[PDB]
Amino acid sequence: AIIKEFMRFKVHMEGSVNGHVFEIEGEGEGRPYEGTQTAKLKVTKGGPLPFTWDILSPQFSNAYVKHPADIPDYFKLSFPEGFKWERVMKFEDGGVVTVTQDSSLQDGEFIYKVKLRGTNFPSDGPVMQKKTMGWEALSERMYPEDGALKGEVKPRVKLKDGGHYDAEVKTTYKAKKPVQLPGAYNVNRKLDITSHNEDYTIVEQYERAEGRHS
């Protein structure tokens, strides 16, 4: 029931994007105080997916963010009971993805349950045509509001032909018990797909995340 320097996680996602219904199960591990983690994800139902993995990769763990020593770490403080979050991603071409997540600590491992729904992606857009190639480094502003912690970021996906494709992401994180809220601060993240099979039904990803004072 404590957060060790090394921690595994298990994740299950139930998803529908533009009507395509799938599930993913994944196993992760990482170093929660150092801000580093890796996940291996398998599409267990509905593979192969007719859209880019890049809309899914940000949905697979804030207990693994390196926080400065003088900032309350809302995520870590929420355990063992854990926390929930709700996220909306609005992409520039009208696609919307809504995500809700439950995080808990059972038997020495984090357990994540994720529900995702994506709609209104243009059929010939970058998402449904797999035209994207991963996220640029991003800075999530975290700020306290109404007894919850809010995060916001306007991350950019690289396109295969040179462009970028923009999104606005808003997330509300809520501990399951009352915990101390920090003052506003930033989390800097770099999320990479490090390997995948031909049709992206088995995918490994890596993330490094670190909090900084504003």
**100 to each of 69, 87, 171, how far by Cα in Å?**
29, 6, 9
The reply to whether omega before 182 is within 30° of 0 (cis) is no
Largest CA distance in the chain: 48
Torsion over CA: 81, 86, 17, 57 (sign): negative
Tokens of 45: 């139902």
Please state the CATH superfamily assignment of the domain spanning residues 1-214 in this structure: Green fluorescent protein (2.40.155.10)
Q: Which residues contact 123 (CB under 8 A, 6 or more apart)?
A: 18
Domain ranges in the chain are: 1-214
